[PDB]
Amino acid sequence: NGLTVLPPLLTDEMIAQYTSALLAGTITSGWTFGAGPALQIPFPMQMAYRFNGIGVTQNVLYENQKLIANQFNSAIGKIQDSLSSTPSALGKLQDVV
Amino acid sequence: LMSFPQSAPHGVVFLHVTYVPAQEKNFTTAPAICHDGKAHFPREGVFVSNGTHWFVTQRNFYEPQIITTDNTFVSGNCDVVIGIVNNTVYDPLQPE
């Protein structure tokens, strides 16, 4: 009846590549890649910079990096658990579609 | 840094003067320095090494400075921090 849906310009693969590039730049350069050229930096130092930005001294991170990494891994696991537990996480996109 | 507005027909033009770094170089870094069996952490700089010595510089501009007591603060011992290296710490009171 004339209703034609056009595909988007950037496919799912290109969006995934953009997301992976964003993630790699974030984990390898912090915020330097967004302002200009990417500058490599260890991720513990990036976390120390973030803690200094939120008003926490970096020694608290350099003394509890192990616990912080464990908590981060547990939170990442719980995120996937919540995503697989109920489809209400993407309810906004589902309602749009 | 700063922006300058400009009048335009049915609009406005901002001249965003921004700071863009360039000419970067690779340096060896360490999370902390251990001299008197105690951990040292930079207050605002970052520990860097040019292969021969260790210096403290800004996180946005290369400016090597001697690792002094005024630039670092002690917090805990060395065996807790992972990746800590051994290097002497300068003290301005010692020459006097």
Side-chain angles (χ1 to χ4, degrees):
Chain A
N1 299 273
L3 309 186
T4 302
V5 176
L6 270 60
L9 180 59
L10 298 180
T11 59
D12 300 330
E13 290 76 12
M14 295 183 176
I15 299 300
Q17 291 184 190
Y18 270 150
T19 303
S20 62
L22 285 163
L23 174 56
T26 303
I27 65 180
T28 55
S29 58
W31 58 73
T32 60
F33 79 103
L39 310 179
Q40 60 275 6
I41 172 182
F43 192 84
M45 306 195 63
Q46 178 179 178
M47 278 296 187
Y49 287 168
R50 297 307 215 275
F51 270 69
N52 291 128
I54 70 171
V56 182
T57 59
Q58 56 185 178
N59 55 264
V60 185
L61 179 106
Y62 287 153
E63 293 178 0
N64 300 271
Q65 177 184 350
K66 182 63 62 60
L67 179 60
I68 292 180
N70 295 331
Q71 293 180 1
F72 179 81
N73 297 331
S74 63
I76 291 300
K78 291 191 298 295
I79 288 304
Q80 292 183 342
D81 295 0
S82 180
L83 291 177
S84 300
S85 300
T86 171
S88 60
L90 301 92
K92 298 182 180 300
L93 305 180
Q94 184 66 24
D95 293 0
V96 169
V97 175
Chain B
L1 293 177
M2 62 191 308
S3 299
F4 307 108
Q6 298 298 330
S7 65
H10 301 277
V12 63
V13 182
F14 297 96
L15 302 182
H16 299 286
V17 182
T18 60
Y19 181 89
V20 179
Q23 300 182 4
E24 65 281 352
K25 298 178 58 60
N26 302 331
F27 301 98
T28 302
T29 176
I33 258 61
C34 191
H35 173 51
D36 296 329
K38 298 153 63 181
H40 299 271
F41 311 96
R43 304 179 182 270
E44 41 76 30
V46 50
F47 291 152
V48 297
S49 180
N50 62 330
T52 61
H53 305 79
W54 290 84
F55 301 95
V56 179
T57 178
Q58 310 174 21
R59 56 187 60 180
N60 297 326
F61 185 83
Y62 181 73
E63 184 180 0
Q65 298 180 0
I66 307 300
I67 307 182
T68 63
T69 312
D70 301 0
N71 297 90
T72 57
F73 57 92
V74 185
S75 180
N77 42 266
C78 303
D79 48 320
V80 170
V81 181
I82 301 179
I84 182 173
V85 304
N86 300 331
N87 184 87
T88 178
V89 178
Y90 190 85
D91 189 9
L93 190 140
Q94 293 295 337
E96 276 67 19

PDB file of all heavy atoms in Angstrom, chain A residues 58-63, chain B residues 31-33 38-45 47 69 71-78 81 84:
ATOM      1  N   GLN A  58      44.210   9.837  45.391  1.00  0.00           N
ATOM      2  CA  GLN A  58      44.521   8.665  44.581  1.00  0.00           C
ATOM      3  C   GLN A  58      45.143   7.535  45.392  1.00  0.00           C
ATOM      4  O   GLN A  58      45.204   6.400  44.905  1.00  0.00           O
ATOM      5  CB  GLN A  58      45.453   9.056  43.432  1.00  0.00           C
ATOM      6  CG  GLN A  58      46.732   9.742  43.877  1.00  0.00           C
ATOM      7  CD  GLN A  58      47.573  10.212  42.706  1.00  0.00           C
ATOM      8  OE1 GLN A  58      48.624  10.824  42.889  1.00  0.00           O
ATOM      9  NE2 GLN A  58      47.111   9.927  41.494  1.00  0.00           N
ATOM     10  N   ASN A  59      45.609   7.813  46.614  1.00  0.00           N
ATOM     11  CA  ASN A  59      46.159   6.742  47.439  1.00  0.00           C
ATOM     12  C   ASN A  59      45.080   5.752  47.854  1.00  0.00           C
ATOM     13  O   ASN A  59      45.361   4.557  48.005  1.00  0.00           O
ATOM     14  CB  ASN A  59      46.858   7.322  48.670  1.00  0.00           C
ATOM     15  CG  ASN A  59      45.962   8.238  49.477  1.00  0.00           C
ATOM     16  OD1 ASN A  59      45.995   9.457  49.312  1.00  0.00           O
ATOM     17  ND2 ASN A  59      45.161   7.657  50.364  1.00  0.00           N
ATOM     18  N   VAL A  60      43.842   6.222  48.027  1.00  0.00           N
ATOM     19  CA  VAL A  60      42.737   5.318  48.331  1.00  0.00           C
ATOM     20  C   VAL A  60      42.548   4.310  47.206  1.00  0.00           C
ATOM     21  O   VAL A  60      42.202   3.148  47.451  1.00  0.00           O
ATOM     22  CB  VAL A  60      41.449   6.122  48.594  1.00  0.00           C
ATOM     23  CG1 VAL A  60      40.321   5.199  49.030  1.00  0.00           C
ATOM     24  CG2 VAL A  60      41.700   7.199  49.639  1.00  0.00           C
ATOM     25  N   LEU A  61      42.779   4.729  45.961  1.00  0.00           N
ATOM     26  CA  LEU A  61      42.686   3.809  44.834  1.00  0.00           C
ATOM     27  C   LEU A  61      43.923   2.924  44.735  1.00  0.00           C
ATOM     28  O   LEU A  61      43.822   1.731  44.433  1.00  0.00           O
ATOM     29  CB  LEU A  61      42.487   4.588  43.533  1.00  0.00           C
ATOM     30  CG  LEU A  61      42.409   3.733  42.267  1.00  0.00           C
ATOM     31  CD1 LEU A  61      40.980   3.650  41.763  1.00  0.00           C
ATOM     32  CD2 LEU A  61      43.336   4.268  41.190  1.00  0.00           C
ATOM     33  N   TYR A  62      45.104   3.490  44.987  1.00  0.00           N
ATOM     34  CA  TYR A  62      46.327   2.703  44.853  1.00  0.00           C
ATOM     35  C   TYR A  62      46.456   1.680  45.975  1.00  0.00           C
ATOM     36  O   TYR A  62      47.264   0.748  45.886  1.00  0.00           O
ATOM     37  CB  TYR A  62      47.543   3.628  44.811  1.00  0.00           C
ATOM     38  CG  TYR A  62      47.672   4.389  43.509  1.00  0.00           C
ATOM     39  CD1 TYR A  62      48.322   5.615  43.457  1.00  0.00           C
ATOM     40  CD2 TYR A  62      47.139   3.881  42.331  1.00  0.00           C
ATOM     41  CE1 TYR A  62      48.441   6.311  42.269  1.00  0.00           C
ATOM     42  CE2 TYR A  62      47.252   4.570  41.139  1.00  0.00           C
ATOM     43  CZ  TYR A  62      47.903   5.784  41.113  1.00  0.00           C
ATOM     44  OH  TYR A  62      48.019   6.474  39.928  1.00  0.00           O
ATOM     45  N   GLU A  63      45.670   1.836  47.042  1.00  0.00           N
ATOM     46  CA  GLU A  63      45.674   0.852  48.118  1.00  0.00           C
ATOM     47  C   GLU A  63      44.532  -0.152  48.017  1.00  0.00           C
ATOM     48  O   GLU A  63      44.579  -1.180  48.701  1.00  0.00           O
ATOM     49  CB  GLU A  63      45.618   1.558  49.474  1.00  0.00           C
ATOM     50  CG  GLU A  63      46.863   2.365  49.804  1.00  0.00           C
ATOM     51  CD  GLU A  63      46.750   3.095  51.128  1.00  0.00           C
ATOM     52  OE1 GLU A  63      45.695   2.976  51.786  1.00  0.00           O
ATOM     53  OE2 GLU A  63      47.714   3.790  51.509  1.00  0.00           O
TER      54      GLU A  63
ATOM     55  N   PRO B  31      52.983   4.546  39.415  1.00  0.00           N
ATOM     56  CA  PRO B  31      51.918   5.061  40.291  1.00  0.00           C
ATOM     57  C   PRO B  31      52.432   5.725  41.556  1.00  0.00           C
ATOM     58  O   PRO B  31      51.754   6.617  42.080  1.00  0.00           O
ATOM     59  CB  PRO B  31      51.095   3.807  40.614  1.00  0.00           C
ATOM     60  CG  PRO B  31      52.069   2.685  40.486  1.00  0.00           C
ATOM     61  CD  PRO B  31      53.001   3.074  39.369  1.00  0.00           C
ATOM     62  N   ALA B  32      53.598   5.330  42.061  1.00  0.00           N
ATOM     63  CA  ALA B  32      54.120   5.902  43.294  1.00  0.00           C
ATOM     64  C   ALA B  32      55.629   5.721  43.329  1.00  0.00           C
ATOM     65  O   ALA B  32      56.197   4.922  42.579  1.00  0.00           O
ATOM     66  CB  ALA B  32      53.472   5.265  44.527  1.00  0.00           C
ATOM     67  N   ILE B  33      56.271   6.479  44.217  1.00  0.00           N
ATOM     68  CA  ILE B  33      57.716   6.440  44.411  1.00  0.00           C
ATOM     69  C   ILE B  33      57.999   6.027  45.850  1.00  0.00           C
ATOM     70  O   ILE B  33      57.308   6.461  46.780  1.00  0.00           O
ATOM     71  CB  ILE B  33      58.366   7.798  44.073  1.00  0.00           C
ATOM     72  CG1 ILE B  33      59.024   7.748  42.692  1.00  0.00           C
ATOM     73  CG2 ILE B  33      59.382   8.209  45.127  1.00  0.00           C
ATOM     74  CD1 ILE B  33      58.071   7.454  41.559  1.00  0.00           C
ATOM     75  N   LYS B  38      58.414   4.507  52.290  1.00  0.00           N
ATOM     76  CA  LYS B  38      57.065   5.049  52.378  1.00  0.00           C
ATOM     77  C   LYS B  38      56.597   5.486  50.995  1.00  0.00           C
ATOM     78  O   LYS B  38      57.398   5.969  50.187  1.00  0.00           O
ATOM     79  CB  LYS B  38      57.023   6.226  53.355  1.00  0.00           C
ATOM     80  CG  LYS B  38      57.387   5.848  54.785  1.00  0.00           C
ATOM     81  CD  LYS B  38      57.971   7.027  55.548  1.00  0.00           C
ATOM     82  CE  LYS B  38      56.969   8.157  55.689  1.00  0.00           C
ATOM     83  NZ  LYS B  38      57.549   9.317  56.420  1.00  0.00           N
ATOM     84  N   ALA B  39      55.306   5.312  50.726  1.00  0.00           N
ATOM     85  CA  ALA B  39      54.758   5.620  49.413  1.00  0.00           C
ATOM     86  C   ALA B  39      54.582   7.122  49.236  1.00  0.00           C
ATOM     87  O   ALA B  39      54.191   7.832  50.168  1.00  0.00           O
ATOM     88  CB  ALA B  39      53.419   4.911  49.212  1.00  0.00           C
ATOM     89  N   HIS B  40      54.871   7.602  48.030  1.00  0.00           N
ATOM     90  CA  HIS B  40      54.717   9.005  47.675  1.00  0.00           C
ATOM     91  C   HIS B  40      53.804   9.125  46.464  1.00  0.00           C
ATOM     92  O   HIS B  40      53.950   8.382  45.490  1.00  0.00           O
ATOM     93  CB  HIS B  40      56.071   9.656  47.377  1.00  0.00           C
ATOM     94  CG  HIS B  40      57.022   9.632  48.532  1.00  0.00           C
ATOM     95  ND1 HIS B  40      57.067  10.631  49.481  1.00  0.00           N
ATOM     96  CD2 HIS B  40      57.967   8.730  48.891  1.00  0.00           C
ATOM     97  CE1 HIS B  40      57.997  10.345  50.374  1.00  0.00           C
ATOM     98  NE2 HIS B  40      58.557   9.197  50.040  1.00  0.00           N
ATOM     99  N   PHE B  41      52.868  10.065  46.527  1.00  0.00           N
ATOM    100  CA  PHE B  41      51.915  10.293  45.455  1.00  0.00           C
ATOM    101  C   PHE B  41      51.882  11.770  45.099  1.00  0.00           C
ATOM    102  O   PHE B  41      51.879  12.627  45.989  1.00  0.00           O
ATOM    103  CB  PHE B  41      50.505   9.832  45.854  1.00  0.00           C
ATOM    104  CG  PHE B  41      50.463   8.450  46.440  1.00  0.00           C
ATOM    105  CD1 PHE B  41      50.480   8.264  47.812  1.00  0.00           C
ATOM    106  CD2 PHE B  41      50.402   7.336  45.620  1.00  0.00           C
ATOM    107  CE1 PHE B  41      50.441   6.994  48.354  1.00  0.00           C
ATOM    108  CE2 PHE B  41      50.362   6.064  46.157  1.00  0.00           C
ATOM    109  CZ  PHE B  41      50.381   5.893  47.526  1.00  0.00           C
ATOM    110  N   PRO B  42      51.855  12.098  43.810  1.00  0.00           N
ATOM    111  CA  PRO B  42      51.846  13.509  43.408  1.00  0.00           C
ATOM    112  C   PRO B  42      50.523  14.179  43.745  1.00  0.00           C
ATOM    113  O   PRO B  42      49.447  13.594  43.594  1.00  0.00           O
ATOM    114  CB  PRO B  42      52.067  13.445  41.893  1.00  0.00           C
ATOM    115  CG  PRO B  42      51.529  12.111  41.499  1.00  0.00           C
ATOM    116  CD  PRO B  42      51.832  11.190  42.649  1.00  0.00           C
ATOM    117  N   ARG B  43      50.616  15.426  44.212  1.00  0.00           N
ATOM    118  CA  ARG B  43      49.413  16.175  44.559  1.00  0.00           C
ATOM    119  C   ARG B  43      48.591  16.503  43.319  1.00  0.00           C
ATOM    120  O   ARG B  43      47.386  16.231  43.273  1.00  0.00           O
ATOM    121  CB  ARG B  43      49.789  17.455  45.307  1.00  0.00           C
ATOM    122  CG  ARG B  43      50.633  17.223  46.550  1.00  0.00           C
ATOM    123  CD  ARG B  43      50.988  18.537  47.226  1.00  0.00           C
ATOM    124  NE  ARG B  43      51.847  18.337  48.390  1.00  0.00           N
ATOM    125  CZ  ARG B  43      51.396  18.141  49.626  1.00  0.00           C
ATOM    126  NH1 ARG B  43      50.092  18.118  49.863  1.00  0.00           N
ATOM    127  NH2 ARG B  43      52.251  17.969  50.625  1.00  0.00           N
ATOM    128  N   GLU B  44      49.227  17.085  42.303  1.00  0.00           N
ATOM    129  CA  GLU B  44      48.541  17.418  41.058  1.00  0.00           C
ATOM    130  C   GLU B  44      49.275  16.977  39.801  1.00  0.00           C
ATOM    131  O   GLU B  44      48.651  16.940  38.735  1.00  0.00           O
ATOM    132  CB  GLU B  44      48.280  18.928  40.977  1.00  0.00           C
ATOM    133  CG  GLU B  44      49.435  19.796  41.464  1.00  0.00           C
ATOM    134  CD  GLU B  44      50.581  19.870  40.473  1.00  0.00           C
ATOM    135  OE1 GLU B  44      50.326  19.768  39.255  1.00  0.00           O
ATOM    136  OE2 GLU B  44      51.739  20.031  40.915  1.00  0.00           O
ATOM    137  N   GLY B  45      50.561  16.645  39.871  1.00  0.00           N
ATOM    138  CA  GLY B  45      51.314  16.240  38.704  1.00  0.00           C
ATOM    139  C   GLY B  45      51.202  14.755  38.426  1.00  0.00           C
ATOM    140  O   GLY B  45      50.274  14.073  38.870  1.00  0.00           O
ATOM    141  N   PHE B  47      53.976  11.234  37.731  1.00  0.00           N
ATOM    142  CA  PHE B  47      55.323  10.687  37.679  1.00  0.00           C
ATOM    143  C   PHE B  47      55.654  10.213  36.270  1.00  0.00           C
ATOM    144  O   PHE B  47      54.920   9.417  35.677  1.00  0.00           O
ATOM    145  CB  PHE B  47      55.470   9.529  38.666  1.00  0.00           C
ATOM    146  CG  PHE B  47      55.427   9.950  40.107  1.00  0.00           C
ATOM    147  CD1 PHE B  47      54.975   9.078  41.082  1.00  0.00           C
ATOM    148  CD2 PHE B  47      55.840  11.216  40.486  1.00  0.00           C
ATOM    149  CE1 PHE B  47      54.937   9.459  42.410  1.00  0.00           C
ATOM    150  CE2 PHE B  47      55.804  11.604  41.811  1.00  0.00           C
ATOM    151  CZ  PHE B  47      55.352  10.724  42.774  1.00  0.00           C
ATOM    152  N   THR B  69      59.491  17.167  48.164  1.00  0.00           N
ATOM    153  CA  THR B  69      58.504  16.893  49.201  1.00  0.00           C
ATOM    154  C   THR B  69      57.254  17.751  49.045  1.00  0.00           C
ATOM    155  O   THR B  69      56.159  17.304  49.403  1.00  0.00           O
ATOM    156  CB  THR B  69      59.122  17.114  50.585  1.00  0.00           C
ATOM    157  OG1 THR B  69      60.389  16.449  50.653  1.00  0.00           O
ATOM    158  CG2 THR B  69      58.214  16.561  51.675  1.00  0.00           C
ATOM    159  N   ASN B  71      55.831  18.558  46.311  1.00  0.00           N
ATOM    160  CA  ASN B  71      55.030  18.091  45.185  1.00  0.00           C
ATOM    161  C   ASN B  71      54.332  16.767  45.457  1.00  0.00           C
ATOM    162  O   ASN B  71      53.440  16.390  44.687  1.00  0.00           O
ATOM    163  CB  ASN B  71      55.906  17.960  43.938  1.00  0.00           C
ATOM    164  CG  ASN B  71      56.481  19.288  43.488  1.00  0.00           C
ATOM    165  OD1 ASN B  71      57.565  19.685  43.913  1.00  0.00           O
ATOM    166  ND2 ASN B  71      55.754  19.984  42.620  1.00  0.00           N
ATOM    167  N   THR B  72      54.704  16.054  46.518  1.00  0.00           N
ATOM    168  CA  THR B  72      54.127  14.751  46.812  1.00  0.00           C
ATOM    169  C   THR B  72      53.642  14.717  48.253  1.00  0.00           C
ATOM    170  O   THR B  72      54.014  15.554  49.078  1.00  0.00           O
ATOM    171  CB  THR B  72      55.134  13.614  46.574  1.00  0.00           C
ATOM    172  OG1 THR B  72      56.306  13.837  47.368  1.00  0.00           O
ATOM    173  CG2 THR B  72      55.524  13.541  45.106  1.00  0.00           C
ATOM    174  N   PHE B  73      52.795  13.731  48.546  1.00  0.00           N
ATOM    175  CA  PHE B  73      52.285  13.502  49.890  1.00  0.00           C
ATOM    176  C   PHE B  73      52.395  12.021  50.222  1.00  0.00           C
ATOM    177  O   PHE B  73      52.166  11.165  49.363  1.00  0.00           O
ATOM    178  CB  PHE B  73      50.829  13.975  50.032  1.00  0.00           C
ATOM    179  CG  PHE B  73      49.881  13.348  49.047  1.00  0.00           C
ATOM    180  CD1 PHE B  73      49.187  12.193  49.370  1.00  0.00           C
ATOM    181  CD2 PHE B  73      49.674  13.922  47.805  1.00  0.00           C
ATOM    182  CE1 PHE B  73      48.313  11.617  48.467  1.00  0.00           C
ATOM    183  CE2 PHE B  73      48.801  13.351  46.897  1.00  0.00           C
ATOM    184  CZ  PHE B  73      48.119  12.197  47.230  1.00  0.00           C
ATOM    185  N   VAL B  74      52.749  11.727  51.469  1.00  0.00           N
ATOM    186  CA  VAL B  74      52.946  10.350  51.904  1.00  0.00           C
ATOM    187  C   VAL B  74      51.624   9.766  52.383  1.00  0.00           C
ATOM    188  O   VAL B  74      50.852  10.416  53.098  1.00  0.00           O
ATOM    189  CB  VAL B  74      54.023  10.279  53.004  1.00  0.00           C
ATOM    190  CG1 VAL B  74      54.306   8.834  53.377  1.00  0.00           C
ATOM    191  CG2 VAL B  74      55.294  10.979  52.549  1.00  0.00           C
ATOM    192  N   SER B  75      51.357   8.522  51.983  1.00  0.00           N
ATOM    193  CA  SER B  75      50.141   7.826  52.398  1.00  0.00           C
ATOM    194  C   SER B  75      50.420   6.325  52.337  1.00  0.00           C
ATOM    195  O   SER B  75      50.476   5.747  51.248  1.00  0.00           O
ATOM    196  CB  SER B  75      48.958   8.210  51.520  1.00  0.00           C
ATOM    197  OG  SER B  75      47.782   7.532  51.924  1.00  0.00           O
ATOM    198  N   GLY B  76      50.593   5.710  53.503  1.00  0.00           N
ATOM    199  CA  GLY B  76      50.813   4.278  53.577  1.00  0.00           C
ATOM    200  C   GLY B  76      52.225   3.878  53.180  1.00  0.00           C
ATOM    201  O   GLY B  76      53.094   4.701  52.897  1.00  0.00           O
ATOM    202  N   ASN B  77      52.442   2.565  53.165  1.00  0.00           N
ATOM    203  CA  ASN B  77      53.748   2.023  52.820  1.00  0.00           C
ATOM    204  C   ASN B  77      53.815   1.667  51.339  1.00  0.00           C
ATOM    205  O   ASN B  77      52.906   1.969  50.560  1.00  0.00           O
ATOM    206  CB  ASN B  77      54.055   0.795  53.678  1.00  0.00           C
ATOM    207  CG  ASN B  77      52.854  -0.110  53.847  1.00  0.00           C
ATOM    208  OD1 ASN B  77      52.111  -0.001  54.823  1.00  0.00           O
ATOM    209  ND2 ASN B  77      52.654  -1.010  52.894  1.00  0.00           N
ATOM    210  N   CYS B  78      54.910   1.007  50.952  1.00  0.00           N
ATOM    211  CA  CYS B  78      55.168   0.773  49.534  1.00  0.00           C
ATOM    212  C   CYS B  78      54.637  -0.582  49.078  1.00  0.00           C
ATOM    213  O   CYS B  78      54.175  -0.721  47.939  1.00  0.00           O
ATOM    214  CB  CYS B  78      56.666   0.881  49.252  1.00  0.00           C
ATOM    215  SG  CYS B  78      57.393   2.464  49.733  1.00  0.00           S
ATOM    216  N   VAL B  81      50.970  -0.633  47.344  1.00  0.00           N
ATOM    217  CA  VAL B  81      50.766  -0.081  46.010  1.00  0.00           C
ATOM    218  C   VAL B  81      51.378  -1.024  44.984  1.00  0.00           C
ATOM    219  O   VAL B  81      52.546  -1.415  45.103  1.00  0.00           O
ATOM    220  CB  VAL B  81      51.373   1.327  45.899  1.00  0.00           C
ATOM    221  CG1 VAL B  81      51.132   1.901  44.511  1.00  0.00           C
ATOM    222  CG2 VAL B  81      50.793   2.239  46.968  1.00  0.00           C
ATOM    223  N   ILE B  84      54.753   0.094  42.277  1.00  0.00           N
ATOM    224  CA  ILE B  84      55.557   1.190  42.796  1.00  0.00           C
ATOM    225  C   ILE B  84      57.037   0.920  42.526  1.00  0.00           C
ATOM    226  O   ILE B  84      57.514  -0.219  42.608  1.00  0.00           O
ATOM    227  CB  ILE B  84      55.283   1.392  44.298  1.00  0.00           C
ATOM    228  CG1 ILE B  84      56.093   2.565  44.851  1.00  0.00           C
ATOM    229  CG2 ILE B  84      55.570   0.115  45.076  1.00  0.00           C
ATOM    230  CD1 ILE B  84      55.747   2.918  46.280  1.00  0.00           C
TER     231      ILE B  84
END
